[PDB]
Amino acid sequence: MKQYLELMQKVLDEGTQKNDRTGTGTLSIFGHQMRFNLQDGFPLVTTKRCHLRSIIHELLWFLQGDTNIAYLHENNVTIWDEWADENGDLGPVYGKQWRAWPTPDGRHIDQITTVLNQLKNDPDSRRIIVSAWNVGELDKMALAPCHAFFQFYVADGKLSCQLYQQSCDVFLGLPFNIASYALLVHMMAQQCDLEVGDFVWTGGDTHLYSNHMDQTHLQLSREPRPLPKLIIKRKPESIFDYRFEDFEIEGYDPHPGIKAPVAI
Amino acid sequence: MKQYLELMQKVLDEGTQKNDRTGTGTLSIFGHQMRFNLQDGFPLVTTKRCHLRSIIHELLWFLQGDTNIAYLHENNVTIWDEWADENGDLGPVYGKQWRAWPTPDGRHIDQITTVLNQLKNDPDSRRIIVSAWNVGELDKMALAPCHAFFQFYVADGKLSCQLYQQSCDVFLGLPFNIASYALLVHMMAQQCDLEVGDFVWTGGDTHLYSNHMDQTHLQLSREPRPLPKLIIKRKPESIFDYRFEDFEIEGYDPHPGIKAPVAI
Numbered sequence: 290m291k292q293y294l295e296l297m298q299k300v301l302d303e304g305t306q307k308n309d310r311t312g313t314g315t316l317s318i319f320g321h322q323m324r325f326n327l328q329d330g331f332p333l334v335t336t337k338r339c340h341l342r343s344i345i346h347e348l349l350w351f352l353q354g355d356t357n358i359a360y361l362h363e364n365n366v367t368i369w370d371e372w373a374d375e376n377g378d379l380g381p382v383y384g385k386q387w388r389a390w391p392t393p394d395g396r397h398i399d400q401i402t403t404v405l406n407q408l409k410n411d412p413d414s415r416r417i418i419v420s421a422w423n424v425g426e427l428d429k430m431a432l433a434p435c436h437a438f439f440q441f442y443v444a445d446g447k448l449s450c451q452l453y454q455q456s457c458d459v460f461l462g463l464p465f466n467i468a469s470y471a472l473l474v475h476m477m478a479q480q481c482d483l484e485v486g487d488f489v490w491t492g493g494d495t496h497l498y499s500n501h502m503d504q505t506h507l508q509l510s511r512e513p514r515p516l517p518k519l520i521i522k523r524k525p526e527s528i529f530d531y532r533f534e535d536f537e538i539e540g541y542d543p544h545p546g547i548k549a550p551v552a553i
Numbered sequence: 554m555k556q557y558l559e560l561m562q563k564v565l566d567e568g569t570q571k572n573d574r575t576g577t578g579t580l581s582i583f584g585h586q587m588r589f590n591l592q593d594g595f596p597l598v599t600t601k602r603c604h605l606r607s608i609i610h611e612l613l614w615f616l617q618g619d620t621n622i623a624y625l626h627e628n629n630v631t632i633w634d635e636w637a638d639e640n641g642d643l644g645p646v647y648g649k650q651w652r653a654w655p656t657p658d659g660r661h662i663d664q665i666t667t668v669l670n671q672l673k674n675d676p677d678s679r680r681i682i683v684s685a686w687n688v689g690e691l692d693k694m695a696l697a698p699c700h701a702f703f704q705f706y707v708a709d710g711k712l713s714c715q716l717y718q719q720s721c722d723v724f725l726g727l728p729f730n731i732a733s734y735a736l737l738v739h740m741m742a743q744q745c746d747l748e749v750g751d752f753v754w755t756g757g758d759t760h761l762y763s764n765h766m767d768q769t770h771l772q773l774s775r776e777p778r779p780l781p782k783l784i785i786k787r788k789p790e791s792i793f794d795y796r797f798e799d800f801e802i803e804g805y806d807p808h809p810g811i812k813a814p815v816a817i
């Protein structure tokens with residue numbers, strides 16, 4: 290999108306060369322922010338074809354509080370394969386923290402449920418937050434959450450959401466996350482009878498991997514196309530009852546997909 | 554400061570009227586980010602006199618893991634009085650989460666020391682984070698932490714830090730928070746033998762209380778003066794051994810102070 294392409298160019302122009310845990314190398318900048326007015330259309334990138342299938346099942350997978358990739362396989366999404374253990378477990382990542390954050394005294398907190406109730410009973414709240422950054426359980430995760438802190442905000446019937454992404458793979462992960470959260474916002478707005486507002490993206494260590502230069506240059510020379518339109522076919526009785534079939538994207542005409550190796 | 558004044562003018566121009574848990578009412582925007590290059594000078598607002606005494610002692614208090622106001626009283630700092638209970642207790646807030654986040658298995662994580670160790674041995678890590686947003690203990694806190702998530706970053710021998718402030722009182726609280734973290738950055742940098750880089754401030758619900766409007770316009774009519782200089786007269790053995798007297802602020806010639814009420 291114009292904002293996304295602009296960020297890519299910034300990394301290439303101002304990025305600092307860094308050696309990462311994978312040994313591949315990265316171009317990096319620290320601190321950036323983009324805003325997507327959801328009224329203008331769904332923020333699914335068009336300068337490269339994105340697969341909405343894996344994006345939607347992952348989100349539904351999170352909402353169920355599931356951390357085993359079994360469900361993702363049932364739907365042919367393999368984005369989490371290389372971090373799962375021999376049994377397909379990732380540890381207490383996203384899904385677990387969102388649905389049942391463990392307290393030191395044994396109880397459990399369902400942040401999604403509390404968020405739903407805050408939006409309905411106390412929309413003006415300044416602490417409508419979901420955090421996946423559970424310090425005392427990080428060592429148990431097969432990987433540290435790269436998008437671990439987000440906040441909802443309501444003003445004039447509109448529902449907005451800001452996501453702080455501490456670590457960000459610009460080429461592979463970013464397009465995925467923008468679409469994923471814009472999706473959650475639409476879902477939330479529907480369950481709470483609100484209009485969709487803005488999706489604010491805030492980055493920390495925002496990088497571009499060394500073996501992605503070519504693909505980035507290719508994508509940068511393409512012209513962005515009008516954003517698609519998200520359509521929700523039916524309104525389920527809760528935020529936990531959605532299915533892949535309920536979503537329909539419309540008017541999505543992207544440039545051809547771009548293959549790129551993942552840094553493991 | 555230029556950036557601060559521009560933020561204020563921004564919430565006044567694009568802000569929406571909202572109500573809050575107190576009943577005062579606020580003018581508010583959602584999503585903002587500004588950067589401070591710490592080598593340009595120490596970011597202490599000059600368009601009104603600020604209280605260094607209070608800012609320094611609060612930070613030293615946090616670093617010790619203290620959550621009782623006794624220490625602050627021994628040094629004539631009353632900024633926390635309204636929220637302390639009969640015994641001076643605030644519950645497990647900033648100081649406790651920073652130095653001793655409780656895990657489910659009975660352990661406690663000292664985030665400050667772990668971050669110091671990461672800055673020395675793994676400065677390229679993208680997980681150099683400190684969080685005060687302990688979902689499992691929110692109900693024991695006198696207040697919900699408003700500046701609960703920050704990240705460190707190293708590049709070209711310079712230490713940077715980004716704070717995500719979910720709820721920000723722009724008139725009263727922002728000047729304090731900006732100076733507080735800028736100070737933490739200097740202390741961190743001195744302990745790791747790094748130079749200071751940027752301080753990036755990102756806000757969620759960024760607001761101005763209704764009864765701060767006249768004071769805001771009064772301040773907006775002033776010309777920011779040159780930024781002061783921070784001089785550290787000693788290099789303590791640890792990040793935990795700093796004293797109020799180790800710090801010297803030079804060239805601080807601010808406009809007169811502007812009094813305003815705190816919305817409890």
Ligand SMILES: C#CCN(Cc1ccc2[nH]c(N)nc(=O)c2c1)c1ccc(C(=O)N[C@@H](CCC(=O)O)C(=O)O)cc1
Nearest residue numbers: 340368369432433434435436461462463465466547551
């Ligand atoms: C972010 C995120 C989600 N993820 C999983 C993922 C990977 C690393 C992480 N790292 C961290 N720290 N946190 C995470 O949550 C995390 C999640 C993704 C993984 C791969 C692709 C990917 O390979 N995309 C390719 C091919 C997609 C396909 O199979 O069709 C592409 O062309 O886009 C996208 C998203």
Ligand SMILES: C#CCN(Cc1ccc2[nH]c(N)nc(=O)c2c1)c1ccc(C(=O)N[C@@H](CCC(=O)O)C(=O)O)cc1
Nearest residue numbers: 631632633696697698699700725726727729730812815
């Ligand atoms: C942020 C923060 C720290 N704090 C404490 C404080 C107060 C409310 C909070 N509210 C929330 N949600 N989170 C917090 O962490 C929090 C912290 C401050 C409190 C008062 C002043 C204040 O009244 N400043 C006035 C008077 C100063 C004085 O003379 O004593 C001024 O003129 O500046 C500044 C900082």
